[PDB]
Every structure is written in structure tokens, then in C-alpha cells.
């Protein structure tokens, strides 16, 4: 074995419950005043109806299952009631040892980000920016657990939120700007000792329901991001021959799966016991509360995140690359 354990960094595609559990614990600490993310009918705090690809990945590589990790959280939560009066809670959570540092909402780059809402009629003034961008996760893992020793496979899957908050937030990043942030982060991993890196591009989200009417902007972003990331990783691989870099082309996998459903009616993998027959609709609608009968016939769980079947598909592809030594 070249590695005996896996470390994960990224966003809702990878998170096994950080976003969920930090909003549960902040809601308890504020006595009901924080909205819970990834609530039922999402599965056990994942942004899906089952395990996500980082969980299947560890099974397919026969390594230990991911365990959630994060750093110490310490914030002054300042809320405002109806009448404009401020109320405050000092929120703390100790650092949580683990291996999967991903968090829903995270963008490539450093720093914390804001993507938690007040609840129960309160508005939030400050103190909810407790979640960590992908590069911040890396920084915190090194602070908490030291440098990498070479016995880890490190997965890095980020960039979707750099697009998301460009569309629906306050950002204006180009794809190749966002890619540069990912390349900086991945260079931090190498400078910190990582010797095996599984780096993913952004999936082909052309048909994601939440991106309807954003297609020109999404398409240009994703194509520019993924071309920049690939070229940048080729360059890092040439400069660091002691590092195995695996390029998980999530884009092409989503594209291939979707073109098989569009042209042939189905994408089937009998080794995995999966058949997808829908790549354009939500299995779960956040308007009716509708969850269709057989959600694992769909690529999309909600308007963006994949079903657990599509997560399994992703994991098999990524594992395949590692098993076959298919490096840059």
C-alpha cells in the first residue's frame, strides 16, 4: 500500500455532516434560533439521500471510513429580534479530530464564509461566519494534526461554490480565477508533505435544476475553471515527481452518464446495481416536499447535489484511477 488512510477537503459533494452538525449545535446553543442545514429528508446530515462519494471511496479502496473533522469554533453570535433588540450568545465548539474536513458551502481559497441563517424570526447581525473554505480547512488540518506524512491519500474537490456564490451571492469570480484558488490550495497540500492527491474538477452541472436560466454563465465558468485546473495540475505534477496526482474528471463522468441517459434512455452499471433514467429533474423538491418513488433513478437528488447512486458512480471512477495508478 502506498497509503493507509484518506483525508478529504471540499464542499457538500464531500461533506459527511459538518454543515449539518454545526447548525444543529448552534441551534441548541441559541435555544432555537439557527436554521438547520441538511435536515430530513436528507440522509444523516449529508446533502444527498445516502452516503456521499468520499464514503464509497474508502470502501472501494479498502481504507478506513471518513470521520468528520473541523477546528475549534469560537464566535459571538449576535442576533436581532423583531423589535430590533440585540441578543447575543457566545458559541464554542472544541476542535473535532477527524479526516473529512469538507463542509457544505465551502469555496476554493482561504478564510471563513457565511452560509448559516437565523431562525424563529430573528435576524443575524454577526457571528455566523463560522464555516471554513476549502483552503481554510487545509490550514486548520495542518494546525491541528500537523503536516502530512506521505501515508495519506488526500482528496480535494472544490470550486462549485465559487460558481454558486458568483451567481447567487456577492461574488464575481471567473472560472480560471476560481481555479487558481484551487491550485493554490493543492500546492499547499504538496508543500505540507502530501504525496498522493486525488484532485477533482467541477462536475458537468449544465442540467442542474438550480442552475436553470444560468446556462451560459455556468458553462463558461465550468469550462474555464476545469481547463485551468487541469493545466495547473499538469504543471504541478511535472514539478513534483514524488507526488502522485490523480485527476478525477468529474465533469466528463457526469457528461458521459448524462449523454447515455439522453441518447439511450439509461445509464446502467450492473456491478454497482445502478440504473439512472433521469438527469434533468430533482428527486426531492424543496417546494412540495415531494420525494419521488425511486430517487436512485436520478442523477440529481435536489437542484444540484447528486443522489447516493450518482455518488457511488463518482466513487467508482475516482477509485479506478487510484487502483490503476493513472496519474498526471
Ligand X SMILES: C[As](C)(=O)[O-]
Q: How far apart are CA 193 and CA 195, in angstroms?
A: 6
The yes or no reply on residue 7 touching Cl ion (CB under 5 A) is yes
> What does 99 interact with, of Ca ion, Cl ion, ligand X, none (CB < 5 to 8 A by kind)?
Cl ion
- Point out which span in 10-18, 203-211, 243-251, 283-291 binds Ca ion (CB under 5 A): 10-18
3-class state of residue 193 by DSSP: coil
Strands 196-200 and 244-248: parallel
Residue 144 or 280 with smaller CB distance to Cl ion: 144
- Point out which span in 8-16, 33-41, 75-83, 226-234 binds Ca ion (CB under 5 A): 8-16
- CA 73 to chain CA centroid, Å, is 20
Residue 153 or 304 with smaller CB distance to ligand X: 304
> What does 7 interact with, of Ca ion, ligand X, Cl ion, none (CB < 5 to 8 A by kind)?
Cl ion
Residue 275 or 285 with smaller CB distance to ligand X: 285
Strands 73-80 and 86-93: antiparallel
Start-end of H helices in the chain:
18-29, 53-61, 134-145, 160-168, 175-191, 215-239, 250-264, 308-323
Residue 10 or 232 with smaller CB distance to Ca ion: 10
Nearest CA among 145, 151, 133, 141 for reference residue 11 = 133
The yes or no reply on residue 100 touching Cl ion (CB under 5 A) is no
CB of 145 to Cl ion, least distance (A): 6
CB of 245 to Cl ion, least distance (A): 18
Give the CA angle between residues 42, 308, 315 to the nearest 5°: 135
Report whether 206 contacts 223 (CB < 8 A): no
Residue 264, C-beta contacts closer than 8 angstroms, at least 6 positions apart: none
- Point out which span in 94-102, 231-239, 265-273, 277-285 binds Cl ion (CB under 5 A): 94-102
> What does 204 interact with, of Ca ion, ligand X, Cl ion, none (CB < 5 to 8 A by kind)?
none
Residue 19 or 316 with smaller CB distance to Ca ion: 19
Residue 12 or 296 with smaller CB distance to Ca ion: 12
The yes or no reply on residue 30 touching Cl ion (CB under 5 A) is no
Under the rule (CB under 5 A), what is the footprint of Ca ion?
12
Amino acid at each position: 500500500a502506498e497509503f493507509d488512510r484518506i483525508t478529504n477537503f471540499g464542499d457538500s459533494l464531500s461533506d459527511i455532516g459538518n454543515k449539518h452538525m454545526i447548525t444543529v449545535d448552534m441551534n441548541q446553543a441559541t435555544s432555537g434560533k439557527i436554521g438547520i442545514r441538511a435536515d430530513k429528508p436528507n440522509f444523516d446530515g449529508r446533502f444527498s439521500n445516502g452516503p456521499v462519494w468520499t464514503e464509497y471511496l474508502a470502501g472501494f479502496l479498502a481504507k478506513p471510513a471518513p470521520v468528520r473533522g473541523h477546528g475549534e469554533i469560537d464566535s459571538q453570535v449576535v442576533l436581532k429580534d423583531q423589535a430590533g433588540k440585540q441578543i447575543t450568545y457566545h458559541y464554542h465548539h472544541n476542535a473535532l479530530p477527524g479526516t473529512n474536513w469538507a463542509v457544505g458551502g465551502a469555496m476554493s481559497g482561504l478564510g471563513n464564509f457565511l452560509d448559516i441563517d437565523a431562525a424563529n424570526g430573528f435576524t443575524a447581525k454577526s457571528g455566523l461566519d463560522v464555516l471554513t473554505n476549502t483552503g481554510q480547512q487545509i490550514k486548520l488540518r495542518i494546525a491541528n494534526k500537523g503536516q502530512f506524512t506521505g501515508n495519506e491519500l488526500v482528496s480535494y474537490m472544490s470550486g462549485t461554490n465559487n460558481l454558486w456564490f458568483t451567481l447567487f451571492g456577492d461574488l464575481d469570480q471567473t472560472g480560471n480565477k476560481a481555479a487558481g484558488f484551487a491550485l493554490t490550495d493543492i500546492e499547499t497540500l504538496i508543500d505540507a508533505g502530501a504525496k498522493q492527491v486525488l484532485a477533482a474538477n467541477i462536475p458537468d452541472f449544465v442540467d442542474a435544476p438550480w442552475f436553470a436560466g444560468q446556462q451560459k454563465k455556468t458553462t463558461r465558468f465550468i469550462q474555464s475553471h476545469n481547463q485551468a485546473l487541469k493545466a495547473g495540475l499538469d504543471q504541478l505534477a511535472a514539478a513534483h515527481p514524488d507526488v502522485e496526482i490523480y485527476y478525477f474528471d468529474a465533469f466528463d463522468l457526469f457528461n458521459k452518464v448524462s449523454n447515455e441517459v439522453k441518447t439511450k434512455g439509461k445509464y446502467q452499471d450492473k456491478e454497482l446495481a445502478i440504473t439512472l433514467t433521469n438527469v434533468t429533474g430533482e428527486a426531492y423538491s424543496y417546494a412540495t416536499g415531494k420525494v419521488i418513488a425511486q430517487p436512485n433513478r436520478n442523477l440529481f437528488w435536489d437542484g444540484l447535489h447528486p443522489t447516493t447512486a450518482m455518488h457511488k458512480i463518482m466513487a467508482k471512477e475516482a477509485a479506478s484511477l487510484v487502483i490503476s495508478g493513472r496519474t498526471l
